[PDB]
Amino acid sequence: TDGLWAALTEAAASVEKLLATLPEHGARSSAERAEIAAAHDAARALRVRFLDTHADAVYDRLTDHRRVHLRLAELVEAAATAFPGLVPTQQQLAVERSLPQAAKEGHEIDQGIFLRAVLRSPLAGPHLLDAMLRPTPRALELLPEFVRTGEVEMEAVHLERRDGVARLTMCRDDRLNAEDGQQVDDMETAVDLALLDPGVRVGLLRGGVMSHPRYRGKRVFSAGINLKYLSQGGISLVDFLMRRELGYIHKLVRGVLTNDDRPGWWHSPRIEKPWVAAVDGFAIGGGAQLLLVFDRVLASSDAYFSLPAAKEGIIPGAANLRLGRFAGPRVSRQVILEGRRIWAKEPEARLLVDEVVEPDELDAAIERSLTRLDGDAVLANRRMLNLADESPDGFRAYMAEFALMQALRLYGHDVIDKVGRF
């Protein structure tokens, strides 16, 4: 119509023709590498140009003019079948997923371009964000059993209702709560259950006792993303990096968007609750990022917080969005641009942590904190605070650039090389 779809289709065909005829990734000459790299670039450039003008119409076809909420995975899958060449097919992703990161063609980058244009739209963006705030099907499935038993054991998370508290314990005892696609699914499911359970008033996130010999008997909050899986090709742009930000982490802030099925929905369409985080040992990378959204943060006297991948790492989620608010532009750049580690007992830890407690008094201090966040006053006040701290436009515009910026970093040679050495 303006020719952009036809040009994209053409440029995608050239890519598929080079991938069919050229040797495997590791066997390509420099001229072959430069040729496919140029074809990828031409195709992706046209993905951007097409969506610059057609994003809203593309989204409208997929969601019936914003009348059906689709989560990220369903959205990019429906976009692949309805707009071939715009984003990779399930089959193309499975081929990618079976390769180590160093050998991938980087088809996820197209999903970054796509989600970029979707989140930039003032119509499509807020709708997709609402879609990710709704309860996961898995949580709705497990909710009756959780109301009954007060307990759910998941692969990466243990959830227990006790004294009105949703106790989320991250329990990957062999690898220091290193994050993966399954951890995100469990965290979101647990986060959904806590919010939907009327017997839960406050949530608590803590790391469990580790079993690895260097930490045996010691709790550890988070060692951040699983670098082994990232090297091996198992960290999904959509199902890990974007899902965690638009899903459970955003629900910690804004709650779960429910159906119009209860009183008061006209004033509170989302159910939100206050959250307490307790940091044992350390919070690193993705785990440090989580602390920027809790209502109360406690840490053991020996803990530290870092976003360590300053030279050859991916973007630390929404830390770049939120850290300036906590620490100011100098400290946030010291932390992110230069990898400054902040210790629980140094004065600037009070920018990130409310309470630092000696190991032998921490359990009791955690329990006291849980009783202080009970009321309706807290619910109203933290809603107004989060609204002031982080506007819908601010979050949307950031996650918009993040979708593409992070996709590129996930395929950067410096990242692949570093992660390979872990």
Binding-site residue numbers are 173, 179, 212-215, 223-228, 286, 315-317, 406
**211-230 residues near ligand YE1, rule: CB under 6 A:** 212, 214, 223-228
Size of the site for ligand YE1 (CB under 6 A): 24
Which partner in a second copy, ligand YE1, none is near 123 (CB below 5 to 8 A by kind)?
Answer: none
- Binding of a second copy at residue 311 (CB under 8 A)? yes
Which residue's entry shows tokens 């608010």?
325
- Binding of a second copy at residue 31 (CB under 8 A)? no
Which partner in ligand YE1, a second copy, none is near 366 (CB below 5 to 8 A by kind)?
Answer: none
Kindly report the three-state secondary structure assignment for every residue of 297-315: EEEECCCEEECCCCCCCCC
Query: Nearest approach, Cβ of 70 to a second copy (angstroms)?
Result: 23
Contacts by 211-214, CB closer than 8 A, 24 or more apart: 211/173, 211/174, 212/173, 212/174, 212/175, 212/176
**156-185 residues near a second copy, rule: CB under 8 A:** none
> Nearest-5° angle of CA 307, CA 312, CA 318?
40
Residue 313, CA atoms < 13 Å, CB-side half-sphere: 22
Q: The tokens of 410 are what?
A: 């996930």
- Binding-site member from 20, 27, 31, 377 for a second copy (CB under 8 A): 377
396 membership: H or E segment, kind and range: helix 392-410
Give residue number: closest CB to ligand YE1. 285
**88-107 residues near a second copy, rule: CB under 8 A:** none
- Whole-number Å distance between alpha carbons of 366 and 123: 42
**Helix residue ranges, H only, 64-107:** 72-82, 90-97
Query: Nearest approach, Cβ of 5 to a second copy (angstroms)?
Result: 16
Binding pattern for the stretch 115-154 against ligand YE1, x by CB under 6 A and - elsewhere: ----------------------------------------
Which partner in ligand YE1, a second copy, none is near 286 (CB below 5 to 8 A by kind)?
Answer: ligand YE1
**285-304 residues near a second copy, rule: CB under 8 A:** 292, 295-297, 301-302, 304
370 and 204 in contact (C-beta within 8 Å)? Answer: yes
- Binding of a second copy at residue 405 (CB under 8 A)? yes
Which partner in a second copy, ligand YE1, none is near 253 (CB below 5 to 8 A by kind)?
Answer: none
- Binding of ligand YE1 at residue 207 (CB under 6 A)? no
In angstroms and rounded to an integer, the radius of gyration of the C-alpha atoms of the chain is 22
Residue 269 CB contacts under 8 Å (≥ 6 apart), including other chains: 257, 258, 260
Binding pattern for the stretch 266-285 against ligand YE1, x by CB under 6 A and - elsewhere: ------------------xx
- Binding of a second copy at residue 45 (CB under 8 A)? yes
Query: Nearest approach, Cβ of 66 to ligand YE1 (angstroms)?
Result: 27
The CB density around residue 82, as the number of other CB atoms within 10 Å, is 12
- Exposed, middle or buried by CB within 10 Å (0-12, 13-18, 19+), for 40? buried
- Whole-number Å distance between alpha carbons of 70 and 59: 10
Binding pattern for the stretch 162-181 against ligand YE1, x by CB under 6 A and - elsewhere: -------------xx-xx--
The CB density around residue 421, as the number of other CB atoms within 10 Å, is 8
Question: What is the contact surface with ligand YE1 in residues (CB under 6 A)?
Answer: 175-176, 178-179, 212, 214, 223-228, 241, 244, 284-286, 308-309, 313-317
